[PDB]
Structures are given as C-alpha cells and as structure tokens.
Ligand binder design. Structure first.
Ligand code: CLA
Ligand code: CLA
Ligand code: CLA
Ligand code: CLA
Ligand code: CLA
Ligand code: CLA
Ligand SMILES: CCCCCC(=O)OC\C(C=C=C1C(C)(C)C[C@H](OC(C)=O)C[C@@]1(C)O)=C/C=C/C(C)=C/C=C/C=C(C)/C=C/C=C(\C)C(=O)C[C@@]12O[C@]1(C)C[C@@H](O)CC2(C)C
Ligand SMILES: CCCCCC(=O)OC\C(C=C=C1C(C)(C)C[C@H](OC(C)=O)C[C@@]1(C)O)=C/C=C/C(C)=C/C=C/C=C(C)/C=C/C=C(\C)C(=O)C[C@@]12O[C@]1(C)C[C@@H](O)CC2(C)C
Ligand SMILES: CC(=O)O[C@H]1CC(C)(C)C(=C=C/C(C)=C/C=C/C(C)=C/C=C/C=C(C)/C=C/C=C(\C)C(=O)C[C@@]23O[C@]2(C)C[C@@H](O)CC3(C)C)[C@](C)(O)C1
Ligand code: KC2
Ligand code: KC2
Lengths: 171, 168, 156, 210, 218
C-alpha cells in the first residue's frame, strides 16, 4: 500500500503504528474515513475563517429575535441557534450522508460501496478527471489539503474551547 | 454552421432564433467568436446578478476597504448597489480591472475565442455528450436570463417605476 | 494577413460579421481599407489634439478646453480656411495616388518597390490597431465634451 | 374507477360528471389516475364512517380516564377538539401520520403480494404490520384474526359495501359538520351544536399560522 | 387560400352573404410573406379577438350584476363600472394578469407537438396540448388550457367544425356587444337600448395603469 495515493510528500509512506502493514486489506476503509474527515475539515476551516469577516444579512429565526450578525464567531454561534434550526441542520446532514453521499455499504460496519474507490460518492454529475497524471495530482491534493485542514480545524477548536475566538493570542 | 451550435431553445420551438439574420453570412472563426462573446456575457451576467443580490440584500464584508481614505464595506453597501460603485477608490477599480485583464490575456493566448468558442477547458461535470448538450443549453439559458436580469436591475435602480416586480 | 490585407489581431481574428467582405471585388477592399486607415489617422490626430490642447494651449492665450467651443470661440475664418486648404491638398494627393496602377490602398510611401518582411506587416497592424482605438476614443471625447462641457484631461 | 360501479349501484353507475379518470395526474398514467382516486374514495370513506360513528358516542358520553374528560359534553365536539391540549392535537395527527407513512411503503406492501395502489395494487389494503422494527401484539385491520377466513364473495361484497357506506357517510358527517357553524344548514337536524370556529383548523385555538 | 375562405363562409350565413370584405384584407402579403400566411394570421386574429370578447362580455355581465370574489384583495374595491374596477386594481394585479395571459399565448405560439404553425398550415386558434409533450415544459401542470376535463375529447369532426363556426359567429357578436358596452361607458347617447344602463366613465379604456390622456378632442 506504499504506492497508493497520499504517500507523495517528504515522508513517503508514513505509517508509524503500522495500521495498514498489519492489515493491508483495511486500507480502503481508512482511506474513506480520512477522506470524509478531510472534507468536513476543509468545510469547517473555511467556515471558521469566513465567518470572521463575512456575515449573512437579516435575522436567523424571526421568532427568537436572533440575527445573523449577533452570533459572535464560533461555538457560541452554534449555541445561539434555535432548536428547530439545529434539528434541520442534523436532518440535512443525515439525509446528505445516509442516502445521497453514501460512503458505506454493508449492514453494520460498512466496507466500501461495491468496487468503487474509497470516497467515490456523488457520481454522474461530478467532474471526472481524465489524464491519469492530472487525476493523481488532483486526488493527492485533495487528500493532503484534507489532512492539513484536519490539523487546522483541530487547532481552531482547541483555541475556541479556551478563548472566545479561534485566533491564538499574540496574533 | 449556425444550425448546429447548442443555442437552439425549445422556448422558440427548438429552432434558431435570428429574426435580423445576423448570422446568415458570418462564417466560422466569427460564429465561434460571437458564441464566445455570448458565453462570456452569460458568465459575467450571472456573476453580476449574484453580486447585485448580495449588495442589495445588504451582506457586505467587515473591515475597511481603503484605510488611507476611509470607505468601509458598510459605506459601500449602504449607498446602494448602483450608487455604491463610485464609493470604491479608483486604485481598487484599477487593481480589479488589472487582475481581470491578466486573466483575460492568459486565457485568450491559451484559448483564442476565434478557435475555441468559449471553451476554456474547465474540467467538466459529465461525459455522455447528450447530457453535456443539455447542460450547455442550461448554461446558455441561465446566462441569457441573467443578461436580461442585470440590465433590469440597473434600469430599476436608476429609473424608478421600470421593472414593476423588482425587489428592494 | 488574409486576402493580402494586414489585420487579423489576436483577441478577435478576421473580424467580418455581416459579410461586408464576402464576395466583394478588390476595388471594394481597397476602398474599405482607405476609409479605415484615413479614419484611424484622422482620429489619432483628433485624440492627440484634444489631449494636448486641454492642458497646453499657448497659441492664442486663454482658449477654454471644451472641444466644440475651441473651434468657435476663436480660430478666425482664415485659419479654418487654411486648415481646410491643407486637408484638401492632401486629399487631392490621395486621389492622385488612387489613380496610379500600383495602388496599395492606404499607402503614400509606395512600399511595393522595396522589399518587405513580416515586421512591416506587424508595424502596419500596429498603425491599424492604434487607429481603431483612437476612432473609439475620439468619438467618446467629443461625446463627453458635448454632454458635460469639459475636455479629456478635464472631467477627471 | 372502471365501469364496475354497476355492481355498486345500477340505474346510476360511472356517473362521472367531472371526468377525472384521464387527467393523467402528475403524468403518471390512466391506470394510476384510477388507482389514486379509488384509494382516496375509500380513505375518505373510512375516516368519515369512523368520524360519524365517532360523533354519536362523543356527544353523549366521554371516556372516564382523565385528560380528554371533564370538559363540557353539551357542546359541539368540533369545539371539543379545540379544548384539547396542544400535545394531544400533535400526537393524534402524528399517530395517523405513522399509519399513512407505514401503509404507503411499497416494500412492506410487496411482503403480502400486493403493490402500491396506483402501480397496480389494490386501492385499500393496510399491511398486516408484521415487519416493524419492534413487534406488537395487535395490528390494525382484523386485530383478532377473525374474519380473514371469509371467502372472496364476502370480501367483494364487503369492499363494495365499504364504498357505498363510505359515500353515504361523507355526506353524513360533512352536512352534520356544516350544521355546527352557520346554523340552519340541514333543516332535518337543526337541533344540535353551536360554535362558529373553523372545524378545518386543528390549531386555531392555540396559535396562528403567520 | 382565398378559396377555402369562401367555403368557410358559405356555411357562415348560407349564401345570403359570402366573402364580404369591402377593403379586401384577403389577397394580401403583409410582413414579407405569402397570401396563405396572411390568411391564417387573419383567421387566428379573428378567432382570438372573438374568444377574448366572449370572455370579456361574460365578465362584464358578472361584474356589473354584483357577483364578486369575497376572498381578500377584490373585497377592497367597491364600485360597479367594470372599467373603474380595473382602474382601481393594484398595479401588481394588472401586471400579473397581463403576464399570465402573455405566458399562455407564448405557449400558444410554441409548436413542439403539433407539426404546423397556424400560419404554416395549422388550425387557427389552436392552443397546443400541455401534456402531449411532457418533457418539454418547465414543470408539470395538468388541466390543459383548452378542455381541462377532456369533456369533448372524442367527438365527430362534423361537430368540431360546427362548433368552430358557432364560436366564430358568437365571437363576432360578442365583439360588437363589448364594444357597445365600452362606448356606453365613454359616449352617452351612443348604442341605443343601452342608455339606461352603464355608468359615465373617463380614462381611455384602451389603456391600463395611469390615465388622463383620452380622446377628449374626439
Ligand atoms: C451579448 C449578447 C448576445 C450575443 C452575442 C448572442 C449571440 C448569439 N445568440 Mg443569443 N441571446 C442573447 C444575447 C446574445 N446572444 C439574449 C439576451 C437572449 C435572450 C433573449 C438570447 C437568446 C438567443 C436564442 C433563443 C438563440 C440565440 C442564438 C444566438 C447565436 C446566433 C444568433 C446570432 O448570431 O445573432 C446574435 C448576434 C449578435 C451580434 C447580437 C448582438 C446584440 C445586438 C447587436 C444588440 C441588440 C440590442 C437589444 C435589442 C437591446 C435590448 C436588449 C436588452 C436591453 C433587453 C449567437 C451565437 C441562437 C442560437 O445559438 O441557435 C443555434 C438562438 O436560437 N440567442
Ligand atoms: C484590462 C482589462 C481587460 C482586457 C484586456 C479584456 C480583454 C478582452 N475582453 Mg474583457 N472585460 C474586462 C476587462 C478586460 N477584458 C472587465 C473588467 C469586464 C467586466 C467584468 C469584461 C467583460 C467582457 C465581456 C462581457 C466580453 C469581454 C471580451 C473581451 C475580449 C475582446 C474585447 C474587445 O473586443 O474589446 C471591446 C470591444 C468593444 C467594441 C467594446 C464593447 C462596447 C459595448 C457595445 C458597450 C459596452 C460599454 C463599454 C465597454 C464601457 C465603456 C464605458 C462606457 C461608459 C461607454 C478580450 C479578450 C469579449 C469577448 O471575449 O468576446 C469574444 C466579451 O464578450 N470582456
Ligand atoms: C463545516 C461546515 C459549517 C458549519 C457547521 C457552519 C456553521 C455555521 N455557519 Mg457557516 N460557512 C461554512 C461552513 C460551515 N458553517 C462555509 C464553508 C462558508 C462559506 C465560505 C460559511 C459561511 C458562513 C456565513 C457567511 C455565515 C455562516 C454562519 C454560520 C452559523 C449559522 C448559520 C448556518 O449554520 O448556516 C450558514 C451557512 C452554511 C453552513 C452553508 C455552508 C455549507 C453556524 C455556526 C452565519 C453566522 O452568523 O456565523 C457566525 C453567517 O452569517 N457561515
Ligand atoms: C460582475 C461581478 C462582480 C463585480 C464587478 C463586483 C464588484 C464589487 N463587489 Mg462583489 N460579488 C460578486 C460579483 C461581483 N462584485 C459575487 C458573485 C459575489 C458573491 C460571492 C460578491 C460578493 C461581494 C461581497 C460580499 C462584497 C462585494 C463587494 C464588492 C465591491 C468592492 C470590490 C470587492 O471587494 O469585491 C469583492 C468581490 C468578490 C469577493 C467576488 C469576486 C468574484 C469571484 C471571486 C469569482 C471570480 C471568478 C474567477 C476570477 C475565475 C473563475 C474561473 C465592488 C463594487 C464588497 C462591497 O463593498 O460591496 C457591498 C463586499 O463586501 N462583493
Ligand atoms: C468605418 C470604419 C472602418 C472601416 C471602413 C473598416 C474596414 C475594414 N476592417 Mg475594420 N475596424 C474598425 C473600423 C473600420 N474598419 C474599428 C473601429 C475596429 C475596432 C473594433 C475595427 C477592427 C477590425 C478588425 C479586428 C479587423 C477589421 C477588418 C477590416 C476589413 C475587412 C472587414 C470589412 O469588410 O469591414 C468593412 C467595414 C465597413 C463597411 C464599415 C461598417 C461601418 C458600420 C456601418 C458602422 C455601424 C456602427 C458601428 C457598429 C458602431 C459605431 C457606433 C459606436 C461608436 C456607438 C475592412 C478593410 C479585418 C481585416 O483587416 O482583415 C484583413 C479584421 O480582421 N477591422
Ligand atoms: C476609448 C473609449 C471610451 C472610454 C474610455 C470612455 C470613458 C467614459 N465614458 Mg464614454 N463613450 C465612448 C467611448 C469611451 N468612453 C463612445 C465611443 C461613446 C459614444 C457612444 C461614448 C458615450 C458616452 C456617454 C453618453 C457617457 C459616457 C461616459 C463615460 C465615462 C463613465 C468614462 C470617462 C459617461 C460620462 O459622461 O461620464 C462623465 C456618459 O454619460 N460615454
Ligand atoms: C456543489 C457543491 C460543491 C462542494 C465541493 C466544493 O465546493 O469544493 C471546491 C474545491 C474543488 C473543487 C471542485 C470539485 C469539488 C472537484 C467539483 C465541483 O464541481 C462539482 C459540483 O462537481 C467544483 C470544483 C472544481 O470547484 C475545493 C475546496 C477546497 C477547500 C474548501 C479547501 C480548504 C482547505 C482548508 C485548509 C487547508 C485549512 C488549513 C488550516 C490550517 C493549515 C491551519 O492551521 C489554520 C490556522 O488557524 C490556525 C489553526 C491558527 C491560525 O493562527 C493560523 C491558521 C489560520 C493558518
Ligand atoms: C416565472 C418566474 C420568473 C421569475 C423571474 C426571474 O426569472 O428572474 C430572473 C432575473 C431577474 C429578473 C427579473 C426579470 C426577469 C427582469 C422579470 C421581472 O420583471 C417583470 C415585471 O416581469 C423582475 C425580475 C427581477 O424578477 C435574474 C436571473 C438571474 C440568473 C438566472 C442568475 C443565474 C446565476 C447562475 C450562477 C451564478 C451560476 C453559477 C455557477 C458556477 C459559479 C459554477 O458552475 C462554478 C463551476 O465550478 C462548477 C460548480 C463546476 C466546474 O466544473 C465549472 C465551474 C468552475 C464553472
Ligand atoms: C362559513 C362557512 O362556510 O362554514 C363552513 C366552513 C367550511 C370550512 C367551508 C366547511 C367545510 C368543510 C370543507 C369545505 C371541507 C373541504 C375540504 C377540502 C375540499 C379540502 C381540499 C384539499 C385539497 C387538496 C389537499 C389538494 C391537493 C391538490 C394537489 C396536490 C394538486 O393540485 C396536484 C395536481 O395533481 C393534480 C391533482 C392534477 C395534476 O394534473 C396537476 C397537479 C400537480 C396540479 C363547513 C363545515 O361546511 C362549514
Ligand atoms: C375506520 C375504518 C374502517 C371502516 C369504518 C371500515 C368499514 C367497512 C365496512 C362497513 C361498511 C365493510 C363492509 C368493510 C369491508 C372491508 N374492509 Mg373495512 N373499514 C375500515 C378500515 C379497513 C381497513 C384498514 C382495511 C379494510 C379492509 C376491508 C375489507 C377487505 C379485506 C380483505 O379483502 O382482506 C373488506 C371486505 C381491508 C382491505 O380492504 O384490504 C383488502 C383493510 O386493510 N377496512 N369495511
Ligand atoms: C374565451 C374562451 C373561449 C370561448 C368563449 C369559446 C367558445 C366556443 C364556442 C361557443 C361559442 C364553441 C361552440 C367553441 C367550439 C370550439 N372551440 Mg372554443 N372557446 C374558447 C377557447 C377555445 C380554445 C382555447 C380552443 C377552442 C377550440 C374550440 C374547438 C375545436 C376543437 C377541436 O377542433 O377539437 C371548438 C369546436 C380549440 C381549437 O380551436 O382547436 C382548433 C382550442 O384550442 N376554444 N368554442
């Protein structure tokens, strides 16, 4: 599994604990888990940075008298969302993952959907890169940006739970 | 060769709409050129409609657009979508035009409009050319509606009473 | 270069929609090229003239900057007649060039006798593109001077 | 519906003033147009037959338990709905909402051999309930497993009798419900009920839609 | 086709009249086309005017009788002279009426199911079927504009042409009637037997929204 995607940077194939050398047949599940984590992390990092200088106009509920511009930046912004809005967000995520972008087949654990690639959701109406060098570069860029976004989103979460902002002190 | 294109719309019964016969005697390397001009107008009009809606709803950025001479993003947004176009400093307009022109020069030297009829080689969301022709027709119809809409917005903001169903 | 004529720039190629040059005699092409080149030269002169006369007008003193007012506030009738006489002399020479049996259209230098390279075509294209730009600029400058009453280096 | 309404009624039968049998109904088809109408024929019958019988018990006696009790009985039961708590109104609708969602599941309907009604299945056929995430003792139709041993002649007679008693009760309850507000509507009754609030407004006594 | 124009009219009022046009709009060419295209256009124009006139006459009778939609925005205006009811309508209501009519006739011009246009050989005054081509409309709507409940559907062609002649005659009479009512609203004394009815009215009937130009100087 040393020649697969993600083993491109200065470290080559970097598996210290050896998850995929102990179980080489478990690489596809780990790749799907990493790809979902990376995509959620890119969305989270972009939301963290963009909510600081961009805010929607108008109200959020028009019943709890809560504005888009009144939610501060972060965890407290998710606090001030009304319970119906939280229910709708969870319904959107559940419908988005259980049926539309389905990362897992199988009864309980979820292997990989058929003979597709790990993280090969959406389908049909999605850009399919030909020219395998370009496809390999695009996929490796996706994976590496996902990993960097995981670390960044974790750091901003660590900052937000001990401050009022995700910006570290001194910045 | 104008009968091929993509632009045959079912709203005019799936035939070419040229009442003035502007494409009767135009030849290739000009038909592709006018298609590229139409496509660029489509894309700029869609982006313009979205930006106009964002400014009219009020959204704007947070900060100071040019700290030397005042002018915040709230100051630009509060003047309106049309009257808040001269509130931007001239250096910002020239920098925006310079970046857009650099992109224009790069894409024109890479994909000439006379040879490539509006195709700059952006990925592509589908194979199966029938579906791709349907998506091309959707892009053309959306861009034409946006072409009408942005000029409608500019007319309704400048001349009141025109465009009766204009929000804001 | 198509049909023996320079032009055909990068941003848009052989620019003939509406079919003005489809199935047309070379005499019509010579007339069209003469019209385009003479328009371009007159418009380059016009644009440079309004730009210079907005801020640098020492020939008569205080002489305004709104370009339609410039031709009427002074420039006595003898001066306008002398300008018209000069232009008529050059147009008579243009007609005499057009009657010659070596008539490259916008050519008073008669460059068919000398050897030419593609650099000559490039310089001809430079003249043509600058001419077209000054065509649009001169129409715009006159329109601004009518609408507002200020010159090109004014209004800013 | 087909021309077999002669079995349900001679003299009349496929009366059909507004044609409604070929309007193509979301582009589905003519058979699917028939299948949707026949289900809404008897689903409206089953509600109205239970509601009219439901009326004749509510107006005299109430269940002695607690929550839907001790409210006045000498009033319109349409008004007695408005006296219910908000949680009672939501739970009543959502309980029916489960029954609607459960009965329309085509994978449940194909367990017993039938199909969704306008894809070719029978118009009215509630599932025998034995596929839920957790088991229950009693199902909905024939709970005691009593009358499913009857022959098809009693089912065919019962299905036609369900329709004919359905049409009779839809006139029965709605004409009765039109007597509560706008009094004097039915000059045969004209001696029951009051209250001018909308019966077609379950939450009017609690909140407002805007 | 200046011959079928006479065959239509031999059944119009017997041979008592026939091809009657004093200024002869037939045998014309119009906007760079053939006589057949002009004939089809004129027939469609007559049919559309007749349909609009019968609908307007019925609407005038209903509105001046007093029958009015209770609902909400139509309860606000309290007049009688149908024209004044249109004048005191909101601008958005009039614009939505105009644009809905415009959409309906935009669909009427579109021929994606029936092969000929009404100028290229199709039947004049033929609104195309909505559900005939279900993949070439923006979103599905049932209840087609002509015959929403398919009441005619299967009928004899003789009944169809008889209904077309009846529609044409009734349309012409309704054109005369609604112009009589409008001229009653504008010119008193005109159109006898109707003087005791209708209200005096000003504001250039053949103009929506704003007013105050009129044919005051006749
Ligand atoms: C930038 C504007 C622009 C341009 C360059 C084109 C170009 C084209 N269109 Mg097109 N179109 C546009 C806008 C434009 N369109 C808009 C806004 C609509 C919606 C109404 C359409 C709807 C449309 C249809 C339905 C069809 C085309 C088709 C075509 C192609 C062939 C027709 C042709 O050569 O004549 C156009 C060439 C021009 C040079 C036009 C330039 C614009 C003129 C000179 C100015 C008009 C001013 C205007 C009347 C003022 C009011 C407009 C506005 C303010 C409301 C061609 C590539 C046909 C096609 O591709 O079929 C294969 C076809 O069937 N177009
Ligand atoms: C440095 C800046 C720069 C440069 C070099 C280019 C270069 C180009 N653009 Mg472009 N563009 C830019 C900025 C730039 N753009 C910006 C900021 C916008 C707005 C978002 C656009 C919007 C735009 C569109 C919509 C189109 C181009 C097109 C083109 C190509 C041909 C241009 C042409 O023939 O001249 C321009 C020639 C003219 C005759 C001018 C048009 C005159 C129209 C009729 C009136 C419009 C008003 C006028 C432009 C504004 C002047 C001020 C006004 C008060 C009078 C070329 C590749 C065209 C193209 O690729 O088609 C093949 C095309 O369709 N551009
Ligand atoms: C991981 C994904 C994620 C999550 C959970 C959130 C969560 C939130 N965003 Mg947010 N956002 C995201 C990605 C995300 N964003 C991205 C990718 C962008 C664009 C670059 C934005 C741009 C954005 C703006 C401009 C605003 C929010 C706001 C908000 C807050 C309330 C409104 C809302 O949920 O819808 C917001 C819309 C989305 C989540 C759609 C993106 C998909 C909430 C805390 C609002 C606020 O008050 O924040 C303090 C607000 O004004 N978001
Ligand atoms: C025709 C396109 C167009 C034009 C000319 C403008 C022009 C302007 N916008 Mg704007 N905008 C646009 C589209 C456009 N916008 C779109 C599509 C959006 C939605 C994302 C926005 C969202 C937006 C906000 C939130 C704000 C502005 C603001 C402004 C003003 C200050 C300049 C600035 O900061 O720009 C910022 C412009 C952007 C961030 C959008 C740029 C377009 C994107 C990057 C697509 C570019 C495509 C790329 C080059 C090639 C792809 C292939 C200026 C008048 C500011 C202001 O003061 O006005 C209220 C401001 O706060 N815009
Ligand atoms: C009236 C001035 C004029 C004249 C006579 C010509 C003549 C010519 N040009 Mg040319 N051109 C002009 C202005 C002119 N151009 C301008 C201003 C530009 C810049 C946009 C160009 C850009 C240009 C290119 C890029 C190319 C040509 C080419 C040609 C040649 C072949 C095309 C043809 O048959 O055109 C005949 C032209 C006419 C008969 C003139 C028509 C005048 C109409 C009636 C004007 C209508 C109004 C107009 C659309 C907008 C003006 C109003 C505006 C200010 C608001 C021909 C010699 C081609 C060439 O050299 O091939 C080798 C070529 O590739 N031209
Ligand atoms: C070189 C081309 C060019 C440039 C840079 C401008 C530049 C400008 N024009 Mg413009 N214009 C041009 C050609 C040009 N124009 C042409 C050819 C016409 C004739 C159709 C006009 C007609 C015109 C009008 C009618 C107006 C402008 C206006 C403006 C200003 C906004 C800006 C300074 C406006 C202005 O006066 O701004 C002060 C204005 O109202 N232009
Ligand atoms: C229609 C919905 C489409 C959704 C998908 C989408 O939109 O994707 C768009 C997309 C590409 C794409 C496309 C496809 C996806 C291929 C297909 C699409 O076409 C379709 C529909 O098929 C279009 C196309 C071509 O565009 C790519 C999006 C990529 C995205 C959004 C990538 C975020 C990285 C963030 C990082 C690396 C953060 C690092 C954070 C780091 C490194 C930190 O440490 C943070 C830091 O804070 C810390 C902790 C402390 C601070 O002091 C300092 C900083 C601030 C540094
Ligand atoms: C019957 C209902 C009619 C409703 C009206 C209507 O229709 O409004 C129309 C209207 C305005 C209007 C009106 C009138 C038309 C004038 C009519 C009314 O006047 C009266 C009285 O009648 C008033 C008004 C205001 O209503 C305006 C319409 C505006 C419109 C139609 C705007 C489209 C944006 C598309 C975008 C931005 C696409 C982005 C797409 C993007 C950015 C991408 O694909 C990115 C991409 O990475 C992807 C994801 C994959 C990559 O591989 C490829 C790339 C890189 C490209
Ligand atoms: C003062 C007074 O009067 O006291 C009155 C008050 C009041 C309330 C009037 C009374 C009552 C009771 C009444 C009248 C109860 C009536 C209830 C009723 C009649 C409720 C209809 C629901 C209709 C629905 C859900 C339609 C869906 C329709 C849909 C979803 C569609 O249109 C879809 C569509 O697919 C079709 C079907 C055809 C397709 O080709 C095309 C399209 C996509 C368009 C009383 C008791 O008499 C007393
Ligand atoms: C409150 C609700 C309600 C009322 C008031 C009501 C009244 C009558 C009357 C009296 C007029 C008759 C005569 C009658 C007759 C039949 N009913 Mg009713 N019925 C109600 C509800 C249901 C449900 C939910 C189902 C059902 C059925 C059948 C079958 C066929 C069974 C069989 O063929 O297996 C027959 C013959 C089942 C079904 O049709 O499935 C095929 C089914 O699931 N019924 N039903
Ligand atoms: C304001 C609306 C309006 C009115 C008041 C009105 C009155 C009458 C009268 C009574 C005076 C008759 C007797 C009559 C008869 C027919 N009408 Mg009219 N009609 C109106 C609207 C339409 C539309 C929209 C269409 C239409 C048609 C037909 C056809 C052809 C059927 C066929 O050929 O199958 C026949 C026979 C269709 C059409 O002409 O198709 C070629 C069609 O599209 N009608 N119509």
């Amino acid at each position: 599994v040393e020649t697969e995607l993600g083993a491109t940077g200065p470290l080559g194939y970097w598996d210290p604990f050896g998850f995929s050398v102990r179980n080489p047949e478990r690489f596809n599940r780990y790749r799907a888990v990493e790809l979902k984590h990376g995509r959620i992390a890119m969305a989270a990092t972009t939301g963290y940075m963009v909510q600081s200088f961009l805010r929607w106009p108008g109200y959020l509920s028009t019943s709890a008298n809560i504005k888009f511009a009144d939610l501060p930046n972060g965890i407290a912004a998710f606090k001030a969302i009304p319970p119906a809005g939280l229910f709708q967000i969870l319904l959107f995520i559940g419908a988005m993952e259980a049926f539309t972008w389905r990362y897992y087949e199988g009864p309980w654990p979820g292997k990989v959907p058929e003979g597709k690639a790990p993280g090969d959701v959406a389908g049909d109406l999605w850009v399919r890169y030909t020219d395998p060098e370009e496809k390999a570069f695009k996929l490796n860029a996706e994976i590496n940006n996902g990993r960097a976004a995981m670390m960044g989103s974790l750091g901003m979460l660590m900052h937000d739970h001990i401050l009022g902002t995700w910006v570290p002190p001194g910045f | 060769a104008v009968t091929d294109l993509v632009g045959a719309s079912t709203e005019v019964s799936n035939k070419v709409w040229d009442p003035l016969k502007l494409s009767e005697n135009m030849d290739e390397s000009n038909l592709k050129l006018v298609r590229a001009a139409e496509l660029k107008h489509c894309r700029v009009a869609m982006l313009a409609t979205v930006g106009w809606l964002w400014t009219a709803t009020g959204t704007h950025f947070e900060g100071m657009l040019s700290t030397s001479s005042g002018v915040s993003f709230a100051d630009v947004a509060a003047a309106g979508p049309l009257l808040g176009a001269a509130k931007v400093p001239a250096a910002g307009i020239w920098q925006m035009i310079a970046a857009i022109g650099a992109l224009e020069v790069y894409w024109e030297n890479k994909y000439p409009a006379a040879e490539c009829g509006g195709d700059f080689g952006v990925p592509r969301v589908t194979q199966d050319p029938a579906k791709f022709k349907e998506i091309q027709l959707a892009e053309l119809k959306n861009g034409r509606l946006a072409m009408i809409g942005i000029i409608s917005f500019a007319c309704a903001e400048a001349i009141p009473g025109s465009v009766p169903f204009y929000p804001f | 270069k198509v049909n023996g004529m320079v032009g055909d720039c990068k941003p848009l190629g052989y620019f003939d929609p509406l079919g003005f040059s489809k199935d047309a005699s070379p005499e019509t092409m010579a007339k069209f090229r003469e019209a385009e080149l003479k328009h371009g030269r007159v418009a380059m002169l016009a644009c440079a003239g309004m730009i210079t006369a907005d801020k640098f007008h020492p020939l008569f003193g205080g002489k305004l900057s709104s370009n339609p007012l410039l031709a009427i506030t002074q420039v006595p009738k003898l001066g306008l007649l002398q300008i018209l006489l000069f232009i008529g002399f050059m147009e008579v020479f243009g007609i005499l060039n057009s009657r010659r049996p070596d008539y490259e259209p916008g050519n008073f230098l008669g460059t068919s006798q000398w050897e030419t390279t593609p650099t000559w075509d490039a310089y001809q294209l430079r003249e043509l593109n600058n001419g077209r730009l000054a065509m649009f600029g001169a129409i715009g400058m006159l329109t601004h001077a009518y609408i507002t009453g200020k010159g090109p280096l004014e209004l800013l | 519906l087909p021309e077999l309404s002669k079995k349900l009624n001679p003299v009349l039968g496929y009366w059909d003033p507004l044609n409604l049998a070929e309007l193509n109904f979301w582009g589905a088809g003519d058979d699917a147009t028939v299948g949707f109408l026949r289900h809404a024929e008897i689903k409206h019958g089953r509600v109205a037959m239970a509601a009219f019988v439901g009326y004749c018990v509510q107006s005299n006696v109430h269940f002695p338990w607690a929550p839907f009790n001790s409210i006045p009985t000498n009033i319109a039961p349409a008004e007695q709905w408005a006296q219910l708590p908000e949680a009672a109104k939501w739970q009543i609708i959502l309980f029916v909402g489960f029954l609607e969602v459960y009965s329309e599941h085509s994978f449940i309907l194909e367990k017993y051999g039938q199909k969704h009604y306008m894809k070719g299945g029978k118009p009215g056929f509630f599932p025998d309930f034995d596929t839920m995430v957790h088991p229950v003792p009693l199902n909905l139709w024939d709970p005691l497993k009593a009358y499913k041993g009857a022959s098809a002649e009693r089912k065919a007679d019962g299905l036609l009798k369900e329709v004919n008693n359905g049409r009779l009760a839809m006139i029965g309850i709605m004409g009765f419900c039109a007597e509560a507000r706008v009094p004097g509507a039915v000059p045969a009754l004209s001696n029951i009920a009051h209250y001018a609030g909308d019966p077609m407004a379950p939450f009017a006594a609690n909140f407002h839609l805007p | 086709e200046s011959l079928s124009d006479l065959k239509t009219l031999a059944t119009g009022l017997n041979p008592v009249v026939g091809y009657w046009d004093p200024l002869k709009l037939g045998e014309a060419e119009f906007w760079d086309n053939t006589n057949e295209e002009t004939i089809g256009w004129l027939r469609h124009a007559e049919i559309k005017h007749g349909r609009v006139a019968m609908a307007g006459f019925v609407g005038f009778i209903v509105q001046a009788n007093g029958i009015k939609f209770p609902w909400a925005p139509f309860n606000a205006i309290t007049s009688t002279s149908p024209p004044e009811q249109w004048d005191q309508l909101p601008d958005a209501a009039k614009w939505q009426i105009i644009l809905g009519v415009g959409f309906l006739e935009w669909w009427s011009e579109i021929r994606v199911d029936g092969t000929p246009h009404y100028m290229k050989g199709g039947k004049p005054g033929y609104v195309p079927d909505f559900d005939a081509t279900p993949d070439q409309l923006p979103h599905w709507v049932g209840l087609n504009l002509y015959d929403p409940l398919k009441w005619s559907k299967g009928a004899s062609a003789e009944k169809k042409q008889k209904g077309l002649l009846t529609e044409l005659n009734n349309g012409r009479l309704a054109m005369l009637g609604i112009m009589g009512f409008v001229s009653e609203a504008k010119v008193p004394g005109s159109v006898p037997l109707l003087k005791g009815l209708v209200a005096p009215y000003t504001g250039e009937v053949m103009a929506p929204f704003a007013t105050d130009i009129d044919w005051s100087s006749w």
